[PDB]
Amino acid sequence: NGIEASLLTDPKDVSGRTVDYIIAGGGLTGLTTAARLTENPNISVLVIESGSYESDRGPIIEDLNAYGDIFGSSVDHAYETVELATNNQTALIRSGNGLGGSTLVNGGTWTRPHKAQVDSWETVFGNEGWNWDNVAAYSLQAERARAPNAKQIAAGHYFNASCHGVNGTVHAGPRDTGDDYSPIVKALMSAVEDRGVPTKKDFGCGDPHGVSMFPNTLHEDQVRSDAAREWLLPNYQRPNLQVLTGQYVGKVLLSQNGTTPRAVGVEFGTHKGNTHNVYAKHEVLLAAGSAVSPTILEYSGIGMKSILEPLGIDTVVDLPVGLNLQDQTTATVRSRITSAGAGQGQAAWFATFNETFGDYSEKAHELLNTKLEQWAEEAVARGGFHNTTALLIQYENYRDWIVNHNVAYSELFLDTAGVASFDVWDLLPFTRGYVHILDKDPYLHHFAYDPQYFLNELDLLGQAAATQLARNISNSGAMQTYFAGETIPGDNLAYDADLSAWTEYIPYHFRPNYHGVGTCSMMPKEMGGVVDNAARVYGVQGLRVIDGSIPPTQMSSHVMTVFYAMALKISDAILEDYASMQ
Amino acid sequence: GIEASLLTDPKDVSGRTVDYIIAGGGLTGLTTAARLTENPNISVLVIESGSYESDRGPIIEDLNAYGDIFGSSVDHAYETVELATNNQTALIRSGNGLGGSTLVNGGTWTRPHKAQVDSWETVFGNEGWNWDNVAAYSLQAERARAPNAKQIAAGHYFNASCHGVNGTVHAGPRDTGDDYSPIVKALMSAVEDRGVPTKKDFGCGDPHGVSMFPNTLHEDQVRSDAAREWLLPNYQRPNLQVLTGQYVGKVLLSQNGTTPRAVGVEFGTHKGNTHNVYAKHEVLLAAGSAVSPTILEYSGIGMKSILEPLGIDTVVDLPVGLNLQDQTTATVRSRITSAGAGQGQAAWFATFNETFGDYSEKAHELLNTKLEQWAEEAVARGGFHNTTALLIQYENYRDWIVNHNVAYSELFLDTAGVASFDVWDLLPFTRGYVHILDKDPYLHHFAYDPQYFLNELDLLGQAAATQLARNISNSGAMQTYFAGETIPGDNLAYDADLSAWTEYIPYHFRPNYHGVGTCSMMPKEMGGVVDNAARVYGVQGLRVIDGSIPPTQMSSHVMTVFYAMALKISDAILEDYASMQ
């Protein structure tokens, strides 16, 4: 009778029962893991998701070109930040609410980071086995990519088959609306070539640099490949896979009768006073998203006493939950185009530090070479992190990425389809923020989410330089043929604005990038981490965090390719322990 | 207890029939539910999206915690369109739970100018909706307490003939127990120097000058939210049912007659798992001004130009969702000397000329010459459909200003350690809209556009009022306590002229969350949606009874009027019930 009829909506169907694994959150990592675990018919899984099934709704979900129309609806959590210090305004964090999580609402861009960035998760953040070669293999295993056709190659696509899986689960291929592709993509490529910048690198191969087109998470018929469509719809008839919709996981139930606390279940519901319990024989897996999974821990008594004590919550395990939050800032440059520029197409410039800063490179490098210690002390003073020595290790890692590997530092993302529009973000922010609960009741959803955008001076300078670069390249070389006047900033910022003018403009003309990671960072406890290299929360048995909370660093890429691989890798660790616990 | 009496399972009501269904358990919905169920033979089902919150603790029960609840599950936080004035989205605070926005509001208890309510009868053709009648219902709803000697010494003045003392809604002076700040009387002295009156009782029908006021709280200072006042005393009535946690999606219509009839509602939280419940007598929409019009549109009641592109058959064509009127608010904040310490709030209800000062000649010239152009422009933006009809509203406002000299702006003072003004133009000429953007009610995909500052007088008036708040903060007796401005502070030069304020204000304001008018109570020929008994035109058994229906803004805080509105509509409903038996 279809997937919808298989979904559970009544809490009484699971209340008081025991399953092998409970997954809080039916998003990208939650549904990937639920599918992987239920391949064994003897493993029972219950997914609890706050939203519902959305993959069949229609174009607002299924058409990637409708991106953004869903914002503000019931399928968007729209988490509100604190009043940001940079501009004394509240910001909204777009985040998908429904089966598939933010894969229901995202831009569909399918790229991978730089090899050195993933390698550092093992060599710097002490996560044995978390290196590019290992993670990339899981990524290719998840991937079901389609090579571009002659039309798509002619528009600018380049596909290196050795960097892609073709027999996996997540359908990926070129976006193709059916119309001609705009010549502006190739014009951007020519414009950066004039400056010695590479083009047409395959951004799945481990060196994202230059201007390239890329695959998207959609089927060949252009239907969005959201994680529910890819991982749940093919498998919903499995009797060992249960999915409860419309309910929030409030906290993890802990048993302290043993020598170490153990997660034995969860409480779920929609309002205080009408909750229900469900129990896990093996493990509870938190996958509610980087903004939520840390709060679930705090409501459970897992977090910093300085936070929990004033709220009346006993601290069962003291950990720096909710710190080390890393999101990027995004600004827009938009220009009208000539009729000859018409057509579809997206592309992105993954720009190095020196490409981003141009003639300011020397001054920017001087800051990078002298201020890391002071920046770390200040971020710690602002509550973004607790241990300055540990944070400095992160900053030195970023310096190594920039100076020794020349990784991409900013992304200039081009949309065409009738205009020339760049969304631009500094990929490697040095600011660190936090998320903390403000009340003991999980169902009040009263929390403080503060990414601390632009409170590090290099983040502001880098964003300003990258956005200025987007204006520059929009009217340089071959792009001049198609340029027909800037509309954003337009009248809001003089066209000849220098870098200092951009730095004054940017704090009042940016949005969150909604790429937040790090709130339950996977790194050693002594470095400020919350989970080990198998995603297990320190000091608690049978509890893991498996979502975007755990990446300890940002990366020069869009994260789906890594997060699918992440979930598969953690799933293998879960299954290994399951076999031992028999 | 009340919590155990509340329904949460849709199967408890699915497929059943009651006499009245009320969509929304907020201020007007719960007042009406209480009035209707006083007759034990009348059954009422309230369907509310939130739950019971009145016992949660200080975040709800302490008016001094105002604002802490924002962004939580008790705040709908409706997002606007990208506003044209600043290319930013704004958040509309709106209470989600039993009591609606009375759970989250500032508690201010004041009434408008007699001439404003009178115009509802003389300009907007609502027989019986005049000050004398509406105020009588307001006093009937009210249970006011006179100020004591400490509260009078701080600046309170209470005219007992303007207040009911045997009603339902507990109201009296806010009193935290601390000393009252001398700054309230300093503000009174500062405006006295300029010929402005003070200590008028803002409940008597002439809101003008600087006065203190009652708050909606009990003597022990617990918030008098509408659930505490109208539901908690009466929840044991078996004919009163309250379903929580569910959204009313649309009204079920029967076109079996010559005119459509409301026979029930569909409710739920997600497409594909909906439920029906039926009304023997009437469906009453009370989901708030941002929502009740969308429920009509989802039901096929609204403008074909909006409904047809979404695939919704227009059953009754009406200008639903137009005529949205909300105000803009800006802040001026200054530190105080230690001698200014203490509790206390006050408000300056300022006339047009008090607001504009030396710009009064300039502002009046605009008001006298551009009303027709402005009305055309608002209509072109989709805030209204009929320019001639909108011009009647504009001339009504002009009459209020020039002939009755009603208050045009409000400068609301908070102390308690600072001197902070929230300032808003009370009478915006801009008109906005709210329209659904999808056929699925449970997707909550809508376009809410108050069109802030898209009328040039609204921007000039806001700028002038906010500049006035800075001015009065450092004038006369207020100088004794001034210890430096913090907002705007460094963000706007302290000597800024009016033009500088007009460029600053679009980037430093918030919605006031007083939106009304989206189902305006006025003749169909004037663009109205409901008649003088709140009945939707062209539909039988359907009313809108909430903040959607006031056709104008008013120089006051609206609770006093909305409680009265609910009682008055309740009488009409019950008279029809009795006459039809």
Ligand SMILES: *[C@@H]1O[C@H](CO)[C@@H](O[C@@H]2O[C@H](CO)[C@@H](O[C@@H]3O[C@H](CO[C@@H]4O[C@H](CO[C@H]5O[C@H](CO)[C@@H](O)[C@H](O)[C@@H]5O)[C@@H](O)[C@H](O[C@H]5O[C@H](CO)[C@@H](O)[C@H](O)[C@@H]5O)[C@@H]4O)[C@@H](O)[C@H](O[C@H]4O[C@H](CO)[C@@H](O)[C@H](O)[C@@H]4O[C@H]4O[C@H](CO)[C@@H](O)[C@H](O)[C@@H]4O)[C@@H]3O)[C@H](O)[C@H]2NC(C)=O)[C@H](O)[C@H]1NC(C)=O
């Ligand atoms: C976001 O919004 C926030 C506001 O919410 C905003 O932050 C405010 O910014 C404004 C500036 O616009 C700033 O206001 C100035 O404050 C000056 C006073 O310095 C402070 O003194 C305070 C009082 O000290 C006494 O009381 C306290 C408490 O009782 C005691 O602890 C003290 O011991 C003492 O007894 C202190 O509270 C305060 O410390 C705070 O700030 C520091 C930050 O460094 C922080 O570490 C600490 O924790 C505290 O929070 C600090 O010492 C005052 O001098 C300024 O007045 C000048 O300017 C105004 C405005 O133009 C004029 O009215 C005055 O007349 C005066 O003018 C003189 O200087 C002008 C130049 O500016 C010149 O033109 C003129 O001719 C004169 O020479 C001013 O009022 C305020 O303090 C900030 N913080 C707060 C909480 O309000 C923030 O910037 C916004 N961000 C964005 C991006 O927009």
Ligand SMILES: *[C@@H]1O[C@H](CO)[C@@H](O[C@@H]2O[C@H](CO)[C@@H](O[C@@H]3O[C@H](CO[C@H]4O[C@H](CO)[C@@H](O)[C@H](O)[C@@H]4O)[C@@H](O)[C@H](O[C@H]4O[C@H](CO)[C@@H](O)[C@H](O)[C@@H]4O[C@H]4O[C@H](CO)[C@@H](O)[C@H](O)[C@@H]4O)[C@@H]3O)[C@H](O)[C@H]2NC(C)=O)[C@H](O)[C@H]1NC(C)=O
């Ligand atoms: C909210 O955000 C919107 C955008 O989403 C924004 O509206 C846009 O504003 C910009 C200005 O900031 C507008 O762009 C300008 O448009 C005119 C052309 O407009 C006419 O013609 C077009 C078709 O050609 C029609 O569609 C339109 O309706 C009008 O009839 C151009 O003249 C402008 O270009 C000049 O300035 C640019 C930026 O500085 C230059 O790059 C360009 O070369 C031109 O520059 C200069 O030319 C000479 C060279 O020096 C010199 O004489 C002058 O310096 C001149 O500037 C510019 O592109 C845009 O149309 C608006 N609408 C849209 C949909 O984009 C809102 O303003 C914004 N609101 C707020 C409050 O921020």
Ligand SMILES: Cc1cc2nc3c(=O)[nH]c(=O)nc-3n(C[C@H](O)[C@H](O)[C@H](O)COP(=O)(O)OP(=O)(O)OC[C@H]3O[C@@H](n4cnc5c(N)ncnc54)[C@H](O)[C@@H]3O)c2cc1C
């Ligand atoms: C606007 C936007 C655009 C993006 N664009 C791209 C792009 O172009 N390319 C790319 O690669 N990535 C993109 N992403 C990133 C990608 O979508 C996310 O990083 C990924 O979906 C995160 O997966 P996750 O499992 O950590 O969380 P999510 O996928 O967010 O899943 C978390 C789930 O938990 C649910 N939930 C929340 N609270 C609770 C609770 N208390 N109980 C139960 N369930 C709960 C949520 O409703 C959601 O279903 C974008 C993200 C956003 C927000």
Ligand SMILES: Cc1cc2nc3c(=O)[nH]c(=O)nc-3n(C[C@H](O)[C@H](O)[C@H](O)COP(=O)(O)OP(=O)(O)OC[C@H]3O[C@@H](n4cnc5c(N)ncnc54)[C@H](O)[C@@H]3O)c2cc1C
């Ligand atoms: C921040 C703020 C401050 C205010 N301060 C003051 C003040 O100081 N003084 C004053 O007099 N007034 C004040 N008010 C105004 C007052 O609170 C409101 O005008 C009044 O509460 C409106 O009553 P209503 O019945 O129209 O709607 P509400 O009281 O908002 O009731 C609407 C109810 O419907 C529910 N609902 C929504 N959608 C649905 C649906 N689809 N199905 C079912 N239920 C639904 C809501 O959750 C809510 O309970 C303030 C308002 C706000 C927002």
Ligand SMILES: *[C@@H]1O[C@H](CO)[C@@H](O[C@@H]2O[C@H](CO)[C@@H](O)[C@H](O)[C@H]2NC(C)=O)[C@H](O)[C@H]1NC(C)=O
């Ligand atoms: C980016 O520009 C910077 C600054 O101009 C260059 O940095 C210098 O590189 C030389 C050669 O390695 C070093 O000896 C200097 O100490 C560097 N200066 C600073 C301030 O760090 C850098 O070479 C450029 N990088 C690329 C890839 O072109």
Ligand SMILES: *[C@@H]1O[C@H](CO)[C@@H](O[C@@H]2O[C@H](CO)[C@@H](O)[C@H](O)[C@H]2NC(C)=O)[C@H](O)[C@H]1NC(C)=O
């Ligand atoms: C702060 O973080 C640093 C870096 O992770 C920790 O320093 C390590 O401490 C252990 C145990 O004392 C030593 O064996 C290591 O040699 C230290 N490493 C470095 C690089 O200095 C430190 O323990 C943390 N301290 C606190 C209080 O959290």
Ligand SMILES: *[C@@H]1O[C@H](CO)[C@@H](O[C@@H]2O[C@H](CO)[C@@H](O)[C@H](O)[C@H]2NC(C)=O)[C@H](O)[C@H]1NC(C)=O
């Ligand atoms: C408000 O101010 C207006 C404009 O300053 C006053 O009306 C003006 O009054 C003067 C003096 O009598 C006349 O010369 C002008 O022609 C009037 N102008 C207009 C446009 O009407 C008005 O009297 C003031 N109102 C109050 C109540 O003080």
Ligand SMILES: *[C@@H]1O[C@H](CO)[C@@H](O[C@@H]2O[C@H](CO)[C@@H](O)[C@H](O)[C@H]2NC(C)=O)[C@H](O)[C@H]1NC(C)=O
């Ligand atoms: C537009 O609104 C105006 C104002 O209500 C309506 O104009 C009235 O039209 C009726 C019927 O033709 C006349 O009896 C009135 O005298 C008009 N009043 C005025 C003041 O001019 C007009 O009908 C409305 N248009 C629509 C389509 O309803």
Ligand SMILES: *[C@@H]1O[C@H](CO)[C@@H](O[C@@H]2O[C@H](CO)[C@@H](O)[C@H](O)[C@H]2NC(C)=O)[C@H](O)[C@H]1NC(C)=O
């Ligand atoms: C605060 O406002 C008052 C009144 O608007 C200002 O004093 C006025 O100054 C103007 C300009 O010279 C004169 O037309 C008025 O007659 C003055 N009014 C009085 C009562 O004397 C005062 O200057 C303003 N304060 C600041 C700092 O701008």
Ligand SMILES: *[C@@H]1O[C@H](CO)[C@@H](O)[C@H](O)[C@H]1NC(C)=O
């Ligand atoms: C394709 O990818 C493989 C693996 O990264 C690499 O060895 C090979 O040279 C690539 N081919 C091209 C043409 O870049």
Ligand SMILES: *[C@@H]1O[C@H](CO)[C@@H](O)[C@H](O)[C@H]1NC(C)=O
């Ligand atoms: C952008 O152009 C300006 C003006 O030519 C130049 O000074 C600046 O360095 C450019 N930015 C970059 C990153 O190249």
Ligand SMILES: *[C@@H]1O[C@H](CO)[C@@H](O)[C@H](O)[C@H]1NC(C)=O
């Ligand atoms: C109270 O207000 C009424 C109504 O406006 C008025 O007639 C009366 O004079 C006032 N009484 C006092 C004592 O101020």
Ligand SMILES: [Ba+2]
């Ligand atoms: Ba490709």
Ligand SMILES: [Ba+2]
């Ligand atoms: Ba396919």
Ligand SMILES: [Ba+2]
């Ligand atoms: Ba370089």
Ligand SMILES: [Ba+2]
């Ligand atoms: Ba095109």
